[PDB]
Coordinates of N, CA, C and O in Angstrom, one line a residue:
Chain U
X26 N 0.8 -1.1 0.0 CA 0.0 -0.1 0.0 C 0.8 1.3 0.1 O 0.9 1.9 1.0
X27 N 1.2 1.7 -1.3 CA 2.2 2.9 -1.3 C 1.8 3.6 -2.7 O 1.9 2.9 -3.7
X28 N 1.6 4.8 -2.7 CA 1.1 5.5 -3.7 C 2.4 6.4 -4.0 O 3.4 7.0 -3.1
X29 N 2.5 6.8 -5.2 CA 3.5 7.8 -6.0 C 2.7 8.9 -6.7 O 1.9 9.0 -7.4
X30 N 3.7 10.2 -6.7 CA 3.0 11.2 -7.1 C 4.2 11.9 -8.1 O 5.2 11.9 -7.9
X31 N 3.4 11.8 -9.6 CA 4.4 12.0 -10.8 C 4.0 13.3 -11.3 O 2.8 13.6 -11.4
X32 N 5.1 14.2 -11.3 CA 4.8 15.5 -11.9 C 5.0 15.6 -13.3 O 5.9 14.7 -13.8
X33 N 4.7 16.7 -13.7 CA 4.8 17.0 -15.4 C 6.1 18.0 -15.5 O 6.3 18.9 -14.8
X34 N 7.0 17.4 -16.4 CA 8.2 18.1 -16.9 C 8.5 18.6 -18.2 O 9.6 18.4 -18.7
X35 N 7.1 18.5 -18.8 CA 7.3 18.8 -20.3 C 5.6 19.6 -20.9 O 4.5 18.8 -20.6
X36 N 5.8 20.7 -21.3 CA 4.7 21.4 -21.7 C 4.1 21.1 -23.2 O 3.9 22.1 -24.0
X37 N 4.5 19.9 -23.6 CA 4.4 19.5 -25.1 C 3.0 18.4 -25.3 O 2.1 18.6 -26.1
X38 N 2.8 17.9 -24.0 CA 1.6 16.6 -24.0 C 1.5 16.1 -22.6 O 2.0 16.6 -21.8
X39 N 0.4 15.2 -22.4 CA 0.1 14.9 -21.2 C 1.3 13.7 -20.6 O 2.2 13.3 -21.3
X40 N 1.0 13.0 -19.7 CA 1.9 12.1 -19.1 C 2.2 10.9 -20.0 O 3.0 10.2 -20.0
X41 N 1.0 10.7 -21.1 CA 1.0 9.9 -21.8 C 0.7 8.3 -21.5 O 1.5 7.2 -21.9
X42 N 0.1 8.3 -20.1 CA -0.1 7.1 -19.6 C -1.3 6.5 -19.9 O -2.6 7.1 -19.6
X43 N -1.8 5.3 -20.6 CA -2.8 4.8 -20.7 C -3.6 3.8 -19.8 O -2.6 2.8 -19.7
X44 N -4.4 4.3 -19.0 CA -4.9 3.3 -17.9 C -6.2 2.5 -18.4 O -7.3 3.1 -18.8
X45 N -6.3 1.4 -18.3 CA -7.3 0.3 -18.6 C -8.0 -0.4 -17.2 O -7.5 -0.2 -16.4
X46 N -9.0 -0.9 -17.5 CA -9.9 -1.7 -16.3 C -10.1 -3.0 -16.9 O -10.9 -3.1 -18.0
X47 N -10.3 -3.8 -15.8 CA -10.7 -5.2 -16.2 C -11.6 -5.6 -15.1 O -11.6 -5.2 -13.8
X48 N -12.4 -6.5 -15.4 CA -13.2 -7.2 -14.4 C -12.7 -8.4 -13.5 O -12.1 -9.5 -14.1
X49 N -12.7 -8.3 -12.1 CA -12.2 -9.3 -11.2 C -13.3 -9.7 -10.4 O -14.3 -9.1 -10.2
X50 N -12.9 -10.8 -9.7 CA -13.7 -11.4 -8.9 C -13.9 -10.8 -7.3 O -13.1 -10.8 -6.2
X51 N -14.9 -9.4 -7.3 CA -15.0 -8.6 -6.2 C -15.3 -9.5 -5.0 O -14.8 -9.2 -3.7
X52 N -16.3 -10.4 -5.0 CA -16.8 -11.0 -4.0 C -17.8 -12.1 -4.4 O -18.4 -12.1 -5.4
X53 N -17.9 -13.4 -3.7 CA -18.7 -14.4 -3.9 C -19.6 -14.7 -2.8 O -19.1 -14.5 -1.4
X54 N -20.6 -15.6 -3.1 CA -21.6 -16.1 -1.9 C -21.0 -17.2 -1.1 O -20.1 -18.1 -1.8
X55 N -20.8 -17.2 0.1 CA -20.3 -18.2 1.2 C -21.0 -19.6 0.8 O -22.1 -19.6 0.8
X56 N -20.2 -20.7 1.0 CA -20.8 -22.1 0.8 C -21.4 -22.1 -0.6 O -22.5 -22.8 -0.6
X57 N -21.1 -21.4 -1.5 CA -21.6 -21.6 -2.9 C -21.1 -22.3 -3.9 O -19.9 -23.0 -3.3
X58 N -21.4 -22.5 -5.3 CA -20.7 -23.5 -6.3 C -19.5 -22.9 -6.3 O -18.3 -23.6 -6.7
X59 N -18.9 -21.4 -6.2 CA -17.6 -20.7 -6.5 C -16.8 -20.9 -5.5 O -15.7 -21.5 -5.6
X60 N -17.2 -20.9 -4.2 CA -16.5 -21.1 -3.1 C -16.0 -22.6 -2.9 O -14.9 -23.2 -2.3
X61 N -16.9 -23.4 -3.4 CA -16.9 -24.9 -3.0 C -16.0 -25.6 -3.8 O -15.2 -26.6 -3.5
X62 N -15.8 -25.0 -4.9 CA -14.9 -25.6 -6.2 C -13.4 -24.6 -5.9 O -12.5 -24.8 -6.4
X63 N -13.9 -23.2 -5.9 CA -12.6 -22.2 -5.8 C -12.1 -22.0 -7.3 O -10.9 -22.1 -7.4
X64 N -13.1 -21.8 -8.2 CA -13.0 -21.6 -9.5 C -12.0 -20.3 -9.7 O -10.7 -20.1 -10.4
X65 N -12.5 -19.2 -9.2 CA -11.6 -17.9 -8.9 C -11.7 -17.5 -7.7 O -12.6 -17.5 -6.7
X66 N -10.7 -16.4 -7.3 CA -10.2 -16.0 -6.2 C -10.5 -14.5 -6.0 O -10.4 -13.9 -7.1
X67 N -11.1 -13.8 -4.9 CA -11.3 -12.7 -4.6 C -10.2 -11.7 -5.3 O -9.4 -11.6 -4.5
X68 N -10.3 -10.9 -6.4 CA -9.3 -10.1 -6.9 C -9.0 -10.4 -8.0 O -8.1 -9.6 -8.7
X69 N -8.9 -11.8 -8.5 CA -8.4 -12.3 -9.3 C -8.8 -11.6 -10.9 O -10.0 -11.4 -10.7
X70 N -8.1 -11.0 -11.8 CA -8.4 -10.7 -12.9 C -8.8 -11.4 -14.0 O -8.2 -12.4 -14.4
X71 N -9.9 -11.3 -14.5 CA -10.7 -12.0 -15.3 C -10.4 -11.7 -16.9 O -10.7 -10.3 -17.0
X72 N -10.1 -12.5 -17.7 CA -9.8 -12.2 -19.2 C -11.3 -12.4 -20.0 O -11.3 -11.5 -21.1
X73 N -11.9 -13.5 -19.6 CA -13.0 -13.8 -20.7 C -14.2 -14.3 -19.7 O -13.8 -15.0 -18.8
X74 N -15.5 -13.9 -20.0 CA -16.4 -14.6 -19.3 C -17.6 -15.0 -20.6 O -18.3 -14.0 -20.9
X75 N -18.0 -16.2 -20.5 CA -18.9 -16.9 -21.3 C -18.7 -16.5 -22.7 O -19.7 -16.1 -23.3
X76 N -17.4 -16.4 -23.1 CA -17.1 -16.4 -24.4 C -17.2 -14.7 -24.8 O -17.2 -14.4 -25.8
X77 N -17.0 -13.8 -23.6 CA -17.2 -12.3 -23.7 C -15.9 -11.5 -23.0 O -15.3 -12.3 -22.1
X78 N -15.5 -11.0 -23.7 CA -14.3 -10.0 -23.3 C -14.4 -9.6 -22.0 O -15.7 -9.0 -21.7
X79 N -13.4 -9.6 -21.1 CA -13.5 -9.0 -19.7 C -12.5 -7.9 -19.5 O -12.0 -7.4 -18.4
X80 N -12.2 -7.1 -20.6 CA -11.1 -6.1 -20.6 C -12.0 -4.8 -21.3 O -12.3 -4.9 -22.1
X81 N -11.8 -3.6 -20.1 CA -12.4 -2.7 -21.0 C -14.0 -2.6 -21.0 O -14.4 -1.5 -21.1
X82 N -14.3 -3.7 -20.7 CA -15.9 -3.8 -20.9 C -16.3 -3.1 -19.5 O -15.7 -2.8 -18.5
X83 N -17.7 -2.6 -19.7 CA -18.5 -2.0 -18.8 C -18.8 -3.0 -17.4 O -19.1 -4.0 -17.4
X84 N -18.8 -2.1 -16.2 CA -19.1 -3.0 -14.8 C -20.3 -3.6 -15.3 O -20.4 -4.8 -14.9
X85 N -21.5 -2.5 -15.3 CA -22.7 -3.1 -15.5 C -23.0 -4.0 -16.5 O -23.7 -5.1 -16.1
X86 N -22.2 -4.1 -17.7 CA -22.2 -5.1 -18.6 C -21.9 -6.7 -18.3 O -22.3 -7.6 -18.1
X87 N -20.7 -6.5 -17.3 CA -20.3 -7.9 -17.0 C -21.3 -8.5 -15.8 O -21.3 -9.6 -15.7
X88 N -21.7 -7.4 -15.1 CA -22.7 -8.0 -14.2 C -23.8 -8.7 -14.8 O -24.5 -9.5 -14.2
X89 N -24.6 -7.8 -15.8 CA -25.8 -8.0 -16.7 C -25.2 -9.7 -17.2 O -26.4 -10.4 -17.4
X90 N -23.9 -9.9 -17.7 CA -23.9 -11.1 -18.5 C -23.8 -12.4 -17.4 O -24.3 -13.2 -17.6
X91 N -23.6 -12.1 -16.3 CA -23.5 -13.2 -15.2 C -25.0 -13.3 -14.9 O -25.2 -14.7 -14.7
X92 N -25.9 -12.3 -14.7 CA -26.9 -12.4 -14.4 C -27.8 -13.3 -15.7 O -28.7 -14.0 -15.1
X93 N -27.7 -12.7 -16.9 CA -28.4 -13.3 -17.8 C -27.8 -14.8 -18.2 O -28.6 -15.6 -18.6
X94 N -26.6 -15.1 -17.2 CA -26.1 -16.5 -17.7 C -26.8 -17.6 -17.0 O -26.1 -17.7 -15.7
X95 N -28.0 -17.8 -17.2 CA -28.4 -18.9 -16.4 C -28.4 -20.1 -16.8 O -28.9 -20.7 -17.8
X96 N -27.6 -21.0 -15.8 CA -27.3 -22.1 -16.4 C -25.7 -22.5 -15.9 O -25.5 -23.0 -14.9
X97 N -25.0 -22.3 -17.1 CA -23.5 -22.6 -16.9 C -22.8 -21.2 -17.5 O -22.8 -20.9 -18.7
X98 N -21.9 -20.9 -16.5 CA -21.1 -19.7 -16.9 C -19.5 -20.0 -16.9 O -19.0 -20.8 -16.2
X99 N -18.8 -19.7 -17.9 CA -17.2 -19.6 -18.1 C -16.5 -18.5 -17.6 O -16.9 -17.4 -18.3
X100 N -15.3 -18.6 -16.9 CA -14.4 -17.6 -16.6 C -13.1 -17.7 -16.8 O -12.7 -18.8 -16.3
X101 N -12.4 -16.7 -17.7 CA -10.9 -17.1 -17.9 C -10.3 -15.9 -16.9 O -10.3 -15.1 -17.0
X102 N -9.0 -16.7 -16.5 CA -7.9 -15.7 -15.4 C -6.7 -15.9 -16.5 O -6.1 -16.8 -17.2
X103 N -5.8 -14.7 -16.1 CA -4.7 -14.4 -16.8 C -3.5 -14.7 -15.5 O -3.2 -13.7 -14.8
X104 N -2.5 -15.8 -15.8 CA -1.6 -16.3 -14.9 C -2.1 -16.5 -13.7 O -3.4 -16.2 -13.5
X105 N -1.4 -16.8 -12.4 CA -1.8 -17.1 -11.3 C -2.7 -18.4 -11.1 O -3.8 -18.4 -11.8
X106 N -2.2 -19.6 -10.4 CA -3.1 -20.6 -10.3 C -3.1 -21.1 -9.2 O -4.2 -21.2 -8.4
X107 N -2.0 -21.6 -8.5 CA -1.8 -22.0 -7.2 C -1.3 -20.8 -6.2 O -2.1 -20.4 -5.3
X108 N 0.1 -20.7 -6.3 CA 0.4 -19.8 -5.4 C 0.6 -20.1 -4.1 O 0.3 -21.1 -3.6
Chain R
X18 N -5.0 -17.7 -19.9 CA -4.4 -18.9 -19.8 C -5.1 -19.8 -18.8 O -5.2 -21.1 -19.6
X19 N -5.7 -19.9 -18.0 CA -6.4 -20.8 -17.1 C -7.8 -20.1 -16.9 O -8.0 -19.4 -16.4
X20 N -8.6 -21.1 -17.4 CA -10.1 -20.9 -17.2 C -11.2 -21.9 -16.3 O -10.5 -22.9 -16.2
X21 N -12.1 -21.5 -15.6 CA -13.1 -22.4 -14.9 C -14.4 -22.1 -15.4 O -14.9 -20.8 -15.6
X22 N -15.2 -23.2 -15.6 CA -16.3 -23.2 -15.9 C -17.2 -23.6 -14.6 O -17.2 -24.9 -14.0
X23 N -18.1 -22.6 -14.3 CA -18.8 -22.9 -13.1 C -20.4 -23.3 -13.6 O -21.1 -22.4 -14.5
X24 N -21.1 -24.4 -12.9 CA -22.6 -24.7 -13.4 C -23.7 -24.2 -12.2 O -22.9 -24.0 -11.0
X25 N -24.6 -24.3 -12.5 CA -25.6 -23.7 -11.8 C -26.2 -25.1 -10.8 O -26.2 -26.2 -11.3
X26 N -26.6 -24.9 -9.4 CA -27.1 -25.8 -8.6 C -28.6 -26.3 -9.0 O -29.1 -25.6 -9.6
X27 N -29.1 -27.2 -8.3 CA -30.5 -27.6 -8.6 C -31.6 -26.8 -7.8 O -31.9 -27.2 -6.9
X28 N -31.6 -25.5 -8.2 CA -32.4 -24.7 -7.5 C -32.4 -23.6 -8.4 O -31.2 -22.9 -8.5
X29 N -33.7 -22.8 -8.6 CA -33.9 -21.6 -9.4 C -32.9 -20.5 -8.6 O -33.9 -19.8 -7.6
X30 N -31.9 -20.1 -9.1 CA -31.2 -18.8 -8.2 C -30.1 -18.8 -9.2 O -29.6 -19.2 -10.2
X31 N -29.4 -17.6 -8.7 CA -28.2 -17.2 -9.5 C -26.9 -17.4 -8.8 O -26.9 -18.7 -7.7
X32 N -25.7 -17.4 -9.2 CA -24.3 -17.8 -8.9 C -24.0 -17.1 -7.5 O -23.5 -17.5 -6.4
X33 N -24.2 -15.8 -7.1 CA -24.0 -14.9 -6.1 C -22.7 -14.4 -6.0 O -22.1 -14.0 -5.1
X34 N -22.2 -14.2 -7.6 CA -20.6 -14.0 -7.5 C -21.0 -12.2 -8.1 O -21.4 -12.0 -9.1
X35 N -20.1 -11.3 -7.1 CA -20.1 -9.9 -7.7 C -18.7 -9.6 -8.1 O -17.5 -9.8 -7.9
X36 N -18.8 -9.3 -9.7 CA -17.8 -8.9 -10.6 C -17.3 -7.4 -10.4 O -18.4 -6.7 -10.8
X37 N -16.0 -7.1 -10.1 CA -15.9 -5.6 -10.1 C -14.8 -5.2 -10.9 O -14.3 -6.1 -11.3
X38 N -14.5 -4.1 -11.1 CA -13.5 -3.5 -12.2 C -12.3 -2.7 -11.5 O -12.9 -2.0 -10.5
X39 N -11.1 -2.8 -12.1 CA -10.4 -1.7 -11.4 C -9.2 -1.4 -12.7 O -9.3 -2.0 -13.5
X40 N -8.9 -0.1 -12.5 CA -8.1 0.7 -13.4 C -6.5 0.4 -13.1 O -5.8 0.6 -12.1
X41 N -6.2 -0.3 -14.2 CA -4.5 -0.7 -14.1 C -3.6 0.3 -15.2 O -4.3 0.9 -15.9
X42 N -2.4 0.1 -15.1 CA -1.8 0.6 -16.4 C -1.5 -0.2 -17.3 O -0.9 -1.1 -17.6
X43 N -2.5 0.2 -18.4 CA -2.5 -0.6 -19.6 C -1.3 -0.6 -20.5 O -0.3 -1.2 -20.6
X44 N -0.7 0.8 -20.6 CA 0.4 1.1 -21.2 C 0.9 2.7 -21.1 O 0.0 3.4 -21.1
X45 N 2.1 2.9 -21.1 CA 2.9 4.1 -20.9 C 3.8 4.3 -21.9 O 4.4 3.6 -22.4
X46 N 4.2 5.8 -22.2 CA 5.0 6.4 -23.4 C 6.4 5.8 -22.7 O 7.1 6.3 -21.4
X47 N 7.5 5.2 -23.3 CA 9.0 5.2 -23.0 C 9.6 6.3 -22.7 O 9.3 7.1 -23.4
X48 N 10.7 5.8 -21.9 CA 11.4 7.0 -21.2 C 10.5 8.0 -20.9 O 10.9 9.4 -21.2
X49 N 9.4 8.0 -20.3 CA 8.8 9.2 -19.8 C 8.8 9.4 -18.1 O 9.8 8.9 -17.7
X50 N 8.2 10.3 -17.6 CA 8.3 10.5 -16.5 C 8.0 9.3 -15.4 O 8.4 8.9 -14.1
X51 N 7.0 8.4 -15.8 CA 6.5 7.4 -14.9 C 7.6 6.2 -15.2 O 7.6 5.4 -14.1
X52 N 8.1 5.8 -16.2 CA 9.4 4.7 -16.3 C 10.3 5.4 -15.8 O 11.2 4.4 -15.3
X53 N 10.7 6.3 -15.9 CA 12.1 7.0 -15.1 C 11.8 6.9 -13.8 O 13.0 6.5 -12.9
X54 N 10.8 7.1 -12.9 CA 10.9 6.6 -11.6 C 9.9 5.1 -11.2 O 10.4 4.8 -10.3
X55 N 9.1 4.6 -11.9 CA 8.8 3.6 -12.2 C 7.5 3.3 -10.9 O 7.5 2.4 -10.2
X56 N 6.7 4.6 -11.2 CA 5.6 4.8 -10.0 C 4.7 3.6 -10.2 O 4.3 3.3 -9.1
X57 N 4.3 3.2 -11.4 CA 3.6 1.9 -11.9 C 3.9 1.0 -12.8 O 4.6 1.7 -13.5
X58 N 3.6 0.0 -12.5 CA 3.6 -0.9 -13.3 C 2.8 -1.6 -14.6 O 1.7 -1.4 -14.4
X59 N 3.4 -1.5 -15.9 CA 2.3 -1.9 -16.8 C 1.6 -3.3 -16.4 O 2.0 -4.4 -16.5
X60 N 0.1 -3.0 -16.0 CA -0.6 -3.9 -15.9 C -1.0 -4.0 -14.3 O -2.1 -4.4 -14.0
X61 N -0.3 -3.3 -13.5 CA -0.2 -3.2 -12.1 C -1.6 -2.7 -12.0 O -2.3 -1.7 -12.5
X62 N -2.3 -3.3 -10.7 CA -3.7 -2.4 -10.0 C -3.5 -1.4 -9.4 O -2.6 -1.2 -8.8
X63 N -4.4 -0.3 -9.6 CA -4.2 0.8 -9.0 C -5.4 1.0 -7.8 O -6.7 0.4 -8.1
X64 N -5.1 1.6 -6.8 CA -6.2 1.8 -5.6 C -6.8 3.0 -5.8 O -7.9 3.3 -5.5
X65 N -6.1 4.0 -6.3 CA -6.5 5.8 -6.3 C -5.8 6.2 -7.1 O -4.6 6.3 -7.2
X66 N -6.5 7.4 -7.7 CA -6.0 8.2 -8.7 C -6.2 10.1 -8.2 O -7.5 10.0 -8.3
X67 N -5.1 10.6 -7.7 CA -5.5 12.0 -7.4 C -6.6 12.1 -6.5 O -7.2 13.1 -6.4
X68 N -6.6 11.0 -5.5 CA -7.7 11.1 -4.4 C -9.0 10.3 -4.8 O -9.7 10.4 -4.1
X69 N -9.3 10.1 -6.1 CA -10.3 9.4 -6.4 C -10.0 7.8 -6.5 O -9.1 7.3 -7.3
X70 N -11.0 7.0 -6.2 CA -11.2 5.8 -6.0 C -10.7 5.1 -7.4 O -11.1 5.9 -8.6
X71 N -10.2 4.1 -7.4 CA -9.7 3.4 -8.6 C -10.5 1.9 -8.7 O -10.1 1.0 -9.6
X72 N -11.9 1.8 -8.0 CA -12.4 0.5 -8.3 C -13.7 0.7 -8.4 O -14.5 1.7 -8.1
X73 N -14.2 0.0 -9.6 CA -15.7 0.3 -10.0 C -15.8 1.6 -11.0 O -16.8 2.0 -11.3
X74 N -15.0 2.5 -10.8 CA -14.8 3.8 -11.5 C -14.8 3.5 -13.1 O -14.6 2.4 -13.6
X75 N -15.0 4.6 -13.8 CA -15.2 4.5 -15.1 C -14.0 4.9 -15.9 O -13.1 5.7 -15.2
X76 N -13.6 4.1 -16.9 CA -12.5 4.3 -17.9 C -12.4 5.8 -18.2 O -11.4 6.3 -18.2
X77 N -13.4 6.5 -18.6 CA -13.5 7.6 -19.3 C -13.2 8.7 -18.2 O -12.6 9.7 -18.2
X78 N -13.8 8.3 -16.8 CA -13.3 9.2 -15.7 C -11.8 9.3 -15.2 O -11.2 10.3 -15.1
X79 N -11.3 8.1 -15.1 CA -9.9 7.8 -14.9 C -9.0 8.5 -15.9 O -7.9 9.2 -15.6
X80 N -9.4 8.5 -17.3 CA -8.8 9.2 -18.1 C -8.7 11.0 -18.1 O -7.5 11.3 -18.3
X81 N -10.2 11.0 -17.8 CA -10.4 12.4 -17.7 C -9.4 13.0 -16.4 O -8.9 14.3 -16.6
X82 N -9.7 12.3 -15.5 CA -8.6 12.7 -14.3 C -7.5 12.8 -14.3 O -6.8 14.1 -13.9
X83 N -6.7 12.2 -15.4 CA -5.1 12.3 -15.5 C -5.1 13.5 -16.6 O -4.2 14.2 -16.6
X84 N -6.1 13.8 -17.5 CA -5.9 14.8 -18.5 C -6.2 16.2 -17.9 O -5.5 17.0 -17.9
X85 N -7.4 16.3 -16.9 CA -7.6 17.4 -16.1 C -6.8 17.8 -15.1 O -6.3 18.8 -14.8
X86 N -5.7 16.8 -14.6 CA -4.7 17.1 -13.6 C -3.4 17.5 -14.3 O -2.5 16.9 -14.2
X87 N -3.6 18.8 -15.0 CA -2.4 19.3 -15.8 C -1.4 19.8 -14.6 O -1.5 20.5 -14.1
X88 N -0.3 19.0 -14.5 CA 0.9 19.5 -13.8 C 1.5 18.0 -12.9 O 2.2 17.5 -13.4
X89 N 0.6 17.8 -11.7 CA 1.1 16.9 -11.1 C 0.0 16.1 -10.7 O -1.2 16.3 -10.3
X90 N 0.1 14.7 -10.8 CA -0.9 13.5 -10.4 C -0.6 12.6 -9.5 O 0.7 12.4 -9.5
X91 N -1.3 12.2 -8.8 CA -1.2 11.2 -7.7 C -1.6 10.1 -8.1 O -2.9 10.0 -8.6
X92 N -0.9 8.7 -7.8 CA -1.2 7.5 -7.9 C -1.2 6.4 -6.7 O -0.3 6.6 -5.9
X93 N -2.1 5.4 -6.3 CA -2.0 4.7 -5.4 C -2.0 3.0 -5.9 O -2.8 2.6 -6.8
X94 N -0.9 2.4 -5.5 CA -0.6 1.1 -5.9 C -0.6 0.0 -4.8 O -0.1 0.7 -3.6
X95 N -1.2 -1.2 -5.1 CA -1.1 -2.2 -4.0 C -0.3 -3.4 -4.3 O -0.3 -4.0 -5.3
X96 N 1.0 -3.5 -3.4 CA 1.9 -4.6 -3.6 C 3.0 -4.5 -2.6 O 4.0 -5.0 -2.7
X97 N 2.4 -4.3 -1.2 CA 3.3 -4.3 0.0 C 4.1 -3.2 0.0 O 4.6 -2.6 -1.1
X98 N 4.1 -2.5 1.2 CA 4.9 -1.2 1.4 C 6.5 -1.5 1.6 O 6.9 -2.2 2.5
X99 N 6.9 -1.1 0.5 CA 8.9 -1.2 0.5 C 9.4 0.0 0.2 O 8.8 0.9 -0.6
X100 N 10.6 0.5 0.6 CA 11.3 1.5 0.4 C 12.2 1.5 -0.5 O 13.1 0.3 -0.4

């Protein structure tokens, strides 16, 4: 937990930093199918969900996809397995 | 790389999994102020930006914050406190 303050030393353009966002496992129901098997850990970055991209996608969309996904849902993760 | 397929239980209900999004460093200009100091790692998860939360926030908002913050910008990273 450490923040960094970066200052600008060029009046030509912005910092030139492109920040993106990905959908991760914020939280799951206790004693559920996700916790019983341990498919994804709280905080793990998801790459794809039910054949749908999980990068730059809207939070509302990701939540809607899981809601509309009545039956079986697929989740893909990038790196990190056991640890 | 590694994906998991979760199925529904024998009962009319949802999975109960809450998926959230976080703003990370997608890509930055080489030989810049961010790379010179190494404030954030490409792909690293950010906790806050210029005092603005970096969880569940919007991609446009995060980009606007950095753009509107002409001069100096603050960033928060999570990966253990180290000097």
